[PDB]
Amino acid sequence: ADSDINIKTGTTDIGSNTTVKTGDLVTYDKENGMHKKVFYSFIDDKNHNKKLLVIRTKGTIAGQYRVYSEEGANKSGLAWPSAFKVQLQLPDNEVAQISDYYPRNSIDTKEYMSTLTYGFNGNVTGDDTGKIGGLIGANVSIGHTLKYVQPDFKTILESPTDKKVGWKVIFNNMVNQNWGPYDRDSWNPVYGNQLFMKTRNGSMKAADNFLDPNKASSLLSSGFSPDFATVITMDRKASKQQTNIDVIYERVRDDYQLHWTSTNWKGTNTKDKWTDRSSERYKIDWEKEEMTN
Amino acid sequence: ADSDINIKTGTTDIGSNTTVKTGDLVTYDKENGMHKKVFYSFIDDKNHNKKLLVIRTKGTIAGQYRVYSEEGANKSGLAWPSAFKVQLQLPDNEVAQISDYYPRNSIDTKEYMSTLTYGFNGNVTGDDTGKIGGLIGANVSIGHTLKYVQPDFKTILESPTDKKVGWKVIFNNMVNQNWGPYDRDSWNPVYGNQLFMKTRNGSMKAADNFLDPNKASSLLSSGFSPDFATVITMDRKASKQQTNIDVIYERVRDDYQLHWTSTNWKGTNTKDKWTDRSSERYKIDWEKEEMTN
Amino acid sequence: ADSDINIKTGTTDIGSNTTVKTGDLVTYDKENGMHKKVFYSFIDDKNHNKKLLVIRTKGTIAGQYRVYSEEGANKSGLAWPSAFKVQLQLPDNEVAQISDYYPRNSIDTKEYMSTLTYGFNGNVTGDDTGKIGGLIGANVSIGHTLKYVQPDFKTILESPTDKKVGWKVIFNNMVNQNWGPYDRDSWNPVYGNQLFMKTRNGSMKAADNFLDPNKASSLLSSGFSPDFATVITMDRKASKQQTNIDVIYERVRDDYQLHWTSTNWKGTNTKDKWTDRSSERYKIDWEKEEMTN
Amino acid sequence: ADSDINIKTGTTDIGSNTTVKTGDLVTYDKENGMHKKVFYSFIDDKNHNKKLLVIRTKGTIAGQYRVYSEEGANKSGLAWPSAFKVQLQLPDNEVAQISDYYPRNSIDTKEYMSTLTYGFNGNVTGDDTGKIGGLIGANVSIGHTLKYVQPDFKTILESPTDKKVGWKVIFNNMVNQNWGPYDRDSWNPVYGNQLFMKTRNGSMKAADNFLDPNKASSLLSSGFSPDFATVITMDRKASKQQTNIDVIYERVRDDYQLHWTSTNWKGTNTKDKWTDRSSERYKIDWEKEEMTN
Amino acid sequence: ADSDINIKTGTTDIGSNTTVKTGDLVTYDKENGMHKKVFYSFIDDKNHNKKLLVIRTKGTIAGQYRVYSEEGANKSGLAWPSAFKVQLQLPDNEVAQISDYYPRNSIDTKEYMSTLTYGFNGNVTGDDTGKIGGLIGANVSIGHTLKYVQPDFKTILESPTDKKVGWKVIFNNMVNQNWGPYDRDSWNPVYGNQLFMKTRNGSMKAADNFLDPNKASSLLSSGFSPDFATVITMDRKASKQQTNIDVIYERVRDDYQLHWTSTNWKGTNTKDKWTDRSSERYKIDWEKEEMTN
Amino acid sequence: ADSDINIKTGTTDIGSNTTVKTGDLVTYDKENGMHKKVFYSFIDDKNHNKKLLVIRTKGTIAGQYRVYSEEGANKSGLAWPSAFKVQLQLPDNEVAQISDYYPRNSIDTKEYMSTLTYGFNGNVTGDDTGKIGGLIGANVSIGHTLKYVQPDFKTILESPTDKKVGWKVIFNNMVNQNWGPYDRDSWNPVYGNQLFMKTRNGSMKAADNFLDPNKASSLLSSGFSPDFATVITMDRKASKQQTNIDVIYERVRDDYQLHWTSTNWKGTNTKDKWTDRSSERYKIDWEKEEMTN
Ligand SMILES: CCCCCCCCCC(=O)OC[C@H](COP(=O)(O)OCC[N+](C)(C)C)OC(=O)CCCCCCCCC
Ligand SMILES: CCCCCCCCCC(=O)OC[C@H](COP(=O)(O)OCC[N+](C)(C)C)OC(=O)CCCCCCCCC
Ligand SMILES: CCCCCCCCCC(=O)OC[C@H](COP(=O)(O)OCC[N+](C)(C)C)OC(=O)CCCCCCCCC
Ligand SMILES: CCCCCCCCCC(=O)OC[C@H](COP(=O)(O)OCC[N+](C)(C)C)OC(=O)CCCCCCCCC
Ligand SMILES: CCCCCCCCCC(=O)OC[C@H](COP(=O)(O)OCC[N+](C)(C)C)OC(=O)CCCCCCCCC
Ligand SMILES: CCCCCCCCCC(=O)OC[C@H](COP(=O)(O)OCC[N+](C)(C)C)OC(=O)CCCCCCCCC
């Protein structure tokens, strides 16, 4: 908070009394279903030290959640998106540098609660025959309760070097049919990984017996639309005013297969089966303030 | 957050010191009961890279929740809106492209809570006859609690290609008569799908025995009014300054039938029975900045 | 959110650098107790496409909650407002159209919580005679908890056509004497519909035995004041610049009668007994920007 | 709160009607994986008393979470970041001084709840033989509940002297596999420190049996990006207008080793095993208002 | 709230259309580890009645939490900061006065909840021999629950006279090892004051057996940074325009000693053992609007 | 809310385009420890109807919590502030009037919750000898829960007449040693009023056995600083432009005495023992817009 040091709010920011030449580039990769788009902005504030360029890789990545293979009613497969990734890179010999990037790793908290209870009890028992009985008792109780919030997909910021910065979205865990949350490594000796399992012992065809995409999380089927910001600074006295950038939109899928053993379905997951990458190279012209490709 | 990179807030946005020519077009489709409307705005900022056009498909889609067929008191049917859809498409040969779209798939979270309890107990029992008894005990308890919020209708963003983008609204599940939430695939061996069932074993006429539309969710009967935004960019040097768009407002209904077997009502649901589509083609004139049709 | 597409906030709105000629018309209908009022505003922004007119039907509708008929102490009646309605309509041959309307159907959510508990137990029992006993036990528990918020009166938006748009307020359910919520269709074999019942088996006069209006919801007795907004657009090249509108403020009452059978009171409800409508026709003059009548 | 003393808000702040010359310097230390960056701003308000300079050490520090050594399946090690540190220092003979620093130690609160319950009980027991029995009882209960929120990593502000100021981020405790929170000093006689333990008695290779980095907290693997602000004031009449600063980005790792004793895995932690420091010296030129190096 | 009297918000404040000459003075007291700093501002609004001066004693006070003395493994001591204080004073003969001071005593609230429960019970017992038994029971329960939030350190405003005003921060109570909150006066017959005790009956060296500073509250080890505001008014017609102020940063430490009696550790606390004061005298020159020393 | 009537926000307020001459007067009453201060503002808006003057009686009142008398170890007393009061009055013959006053009586709410539970139970018992037993049971439960928040000190606004207006702060109730809240009228047959009691049956000296001021609420010891606003209007055509005001800062103390009967301490409270008043008379000069004294 800038106002917490007594500095008037907004004084230290950059971009006042200047003209910013924004832009936009959109490209669709039919092969991988990645509607990538980048929205840039050239800021050159005279009071600043270096020329600036903010790249916002909005785009969108499809889900690709479908049953790829079926072999009769005995067994069938399924491919689902294990994690989405997007990164920006620069040539090793380039002179520009990565300055900032908004979505960053943040610390996570958890509640905690301790309970202690003392008790006392006493009753008097009697019957018709005149018998009289008594009972005196006591009890103690100690309790620990711990609660926290865990999302289905967890965004991460990979260690950003000077030249390349990249994010990542992975599959934390999911709740199926209102049952206990499952994850890729979850295992049960009888049924196995029940992640995307419709019925434990249904009699339908194996390919049919898969969780309906609507029931599952949206990102699995309808894709994930990133919103990431990075800022690139280039010295104003550099001999060359042209730079090249590479943007990647890789998506990683997994193989989930359920198998009918004798009576019930058995689910197995094979992480990191396929990976799809869609890299496009853009060219930056600092002098003209336009990025084209 | 633009201010989190130290850039002055609002610097990177587009639309400053420019005149935007808005508009409006309203049309009602009596056949399907879809009061469709589009509210557009032409933004051509000199500091930007391409001409812009934002389309907000506000409109409204009716519910169409009524008992379509009745056959005596033995059985009767009912049609309800399973899902609402709206999408924008462009001709394959067009040069414009889809840039953005507001309502997007978002990650969902869930609470979690683990509990552990230790116990101790002891009592002394005595009677008139002088008998003295004792009791010492202990117990342990482990508990997992998981809570999350699930809406009745869940909006989704279908995988947006470069040329076409479309949303979708589906029926998650509903609570009937304060009873457990039901959904399309819910089944009970005795009664069956009790989704829109008034009384389990009422003696009234079959057509009468249906959940009152007021009790159910509003969207089922009174319709759903969308609010979706998309932005279309067209290069300023293109030879042709005219483009055509298509807007669709399809709505999908289901068939719900309850049947009197011997004593109680039995309910069955047949998903995706009917679909109603209302597509209108608009023409865009970038040079004059007006969309008409 | 306009700022979520990178457009500067407020750019796409209409009404900048223009003069709006507001107005006001108030009329009271003594027969039906409806203090109806409309607050209009003519907006004609040169950058827009059509002339605009926003109508805000503020007004107010009385409750009319009273004991209409009494027949000795054996039985008596009561009329209460089941639902309030207000709608705007245009002549079929008119050229203007309905564009927007603020209060719209919204999706409703519900919480959900699943619980699972394991237990263990063991005690050692002994007495004076040296007898020693043991006990080992275990238990499991499964719990589903579902919570949601339900208001007394639920506003709805009837399917809006091009020419007419109307809202509606209905009676969801009410809590009486801190007892379980009741509604119009609620029934109990012994007492019946106990909605507005003071005492189950009081000995007072039948007319007296009714819930005090203060205890009940406010809208029942003191009326409901609507706040609804609609916008009408008319093409700027139309031959005729005059339009007629109709505004209706209908209110629906129900008959609630309690009857002394032998020992306790019995309550019965007869929905949709009376309806009161108060329609006034206004005239719109686009050229002069004034609505009068 | 400035407005709480009746002073108009923002009156006492500094930075109005002045030009601030910002800047930026980025450097990457390949050896230690620390993408350090500093964003400075020279403020010289004529109404103020001294020249000002705010340094925001944004940067980023990698996680470095990996299995460094493995010796067959009997045992293997692991190094994880115990704490991240960053500090600014000035030469002892310098004339500038440290004025402020935003992230500061803050007081922490805890909930508290006391419960007291009285009880009464009575039952009548009878059998076919005509025997009649009674039971009267009472009980009391006292309960203390205390709850508070404890984050995984806890930022601290080391005692700031006049010349040097430094922050610190340490490892509070973590929740593993939904089990009770663990910390560095946690110990269990059977298993030991179960902090980063995959399975208690799994049969896999020792190196394999480690908690997946995705499951653990993000900062452990993907690094921690600091955001700390400090302000340096230098008198405007000083003979020398040049100052030197030192910025350090030390990171401390620990050694976590699990050992297979006879049947189950045993985990041991050795705090403060390695420390990595990356110090860079910057030069400040007050007269020209530029920091370079 | 100024707007609650119908006065336009901000009308009654002071500081509009005037120039405020701020300042800053920083000094570090190596002997006591108190990085004291004062940030002043001279406001002389022509519409006001007196000259104004707001002093914000930001500064910072070190924690000084360490084991001062150890005598073998039998016993050892510890000194921790019991309370931090800071006050401003004026000479008795001075003419200026204290007007305001932000952080002020505030009323504290507590929740409350009363519970009442009625019960009923009945079971039918039978065996093979045809014996039939019954049981009818009832019970009542009354419960009072009271919850409130209590911070570790509680800031107070000492009774402010005309000439001197001073704040105070004291040690409310702390939670150790997730156990019941402890305070200075807490006592246990077996162990004693268990405030900063690592293990109840550990076998390590006495000096070693102390709570790790990281586990404890931050203010204990890393110090407390105050933020207090006071405003001084001086008449504009006074003969002398020079005033002297004194600022004190006293810190009070306590002695905590744990002692090995025969088997377990015993902890004893001796409140108010040492006090450290660091007073500096500043000179105020109203005519020149500068405070120097 | 002004914007809820369609009036542009802030239109109806007073104070626009005018100059307000503020002020300040501070006086300390050594005898009673009341640092009283008044902050006035003369507003004369030409569009208004009367001259305005807002008086904000900020000031501060000391706590005066101490053991006044002790008589050996058998008994001792204590005086604590029961209630703080501040009021403004005008001479009866004056022409000015009291218009407004911010802190006003506000309605207080309470939660409420009704619970109902049905149960069922059944078990099968068997032993080695082949005996088989059964048990079928049921139970019902009704519960009322009511929760609300009650502060320690409750501010009130005494009935404001035309000439005088006064506030009041009283002692609602307090929580001692985490035990049930106590108040002035609380009584216990064995111990008595245990409000400020350290230990029930401690053996220390009577004067020593009193609750530590730090443990109690802050206002008891460190005093209460009021913040109250009132506005006085005087007609602009009045013959006399001078008015006199009286400001009072009375504080009421109570006598709390604990007495050693035979084994335990007994506490008694005598409400309204002493009262301290400090009234100062100010003179208002409307023509010159200055209040002096
Ligand atoms: C895997 C299990 C590892 C052992 C964990 C030990 C830490 C938990 C301590 C514990 O049980 O809580 C403390 C309780 C409650 O009493 P306290 O709060 O200590 O008050 C003393 C009253 N008392 C003498 C009648 C017992 O007092 C006790 O009963 C404590 C007795 C000494 C420690 C052993 C307790 C066994 C707990 C499983
Ligand atoms: C479908 C069921 C699959 C098995 C799930 C195992 C995971 C749950 C572990 C569990 O029951 O919780 C741990 C408990 C509580 O004690 P801990 O927290 O382990 O402390 C040890 C104290 N104790 C030796 C007296 C037991 O200690 C135990 O009693 C654990 C014993 C070893 C695991 C088997 C527990 C059976 C749970 C159904
Ligand atoms: C109207 C009632 C329709 C039936 C509803 C079935 C769905 C509910 C399943 C259920 O009861 O929850 C699962 C429980 C808990 O254990 P799980 O979480 O399955 O862990 C297995 C441990 N166990 C073998 C010792 C039981 O394990 C069981 O006991 C499940 C046994 C198989 C399903 C039948 C359960 C009967 C529930 C009324
Ligand atoms: C490690 C344990 C140290 C001792 C802690 C003592 C402090 C806790 C006091 C306590 O147990 O709570 C007070 C209860 C509840 O009654 P009160 O609220 O005192 O009302 C009196 C009614 N009664 C005479 C029928 C009992 O009344 C009592 O039963 C209090 C009796 C005197 C104190 C001893 C209680 C033993 C608690 C472990
Ligand atoms: C240290 C203890 C001091 C005594 C505290 C007395 C204040 C608490 C009163 C109390 O126990 O709550 C009221 C209950 C519940 O019934 P009520 O709400 O009074 O309804 C009457 C129904 N009844 C006749 C069947 C009892 O009705 C009763 O059982 C109240 C009977 C009269 C007061 C004595 C109750 C004993 C409480 C410890
Ligand atoms: C100081 C006490 C004054 C009396 C307060 C009466 C008001 C409370 C009524 C009450 O107990 O709650 C109603 C319950 C629950 O059943 P309901 O919700 O009435 O459903 C009827 C089912 N049942 C016939 C099997 C009982 O049904 C009953 O058991 C009600 C029976 C008639 C009223 C007497 C109940 C006694 C309560 C202390």
How would you describe the overall organization of this protein?
- This is part of a larger assembly, with six copies of chain A (about 290 residues).
- Chain A has about 290 residues and is mainly β.
- The first copy, chain A, has one domain: Leukocidin/porin MspA (Leukocidin-like), CATH 2.70.240.10.
- Helix content of chain A is about 0%, strand content about 45%.
- The first copy, chain A, is built from one helix and 18 strands.
- In chain A, the strands form three sheets. In chain A, strands 5, 6, 7, 11, 12, 14, 15, 16, 17 and 18 form a ten-stranded antiparallel beta sheet that branches. In chain A, strands 1, 2, 3, 4, 8 and 13 form a six-stranded antiparallel beta sheet that branches.
- In chain A, strand 3 and strand 4 (about 50-55) form a beta hairpin.
- The longest helix of chain A is centred in the last third of the chain and has 5 residues, at about 220.
- Chain A is flat.
- The two termini of chain A are about 40 Å apart.
- The relative contact order of chain A is 0.23.
- The interface of B and D includes residues 6 and 112 of B.
- The complex binds 1,2-didecanoyl-SN-glycero-3-phosphocholine (6 copies).
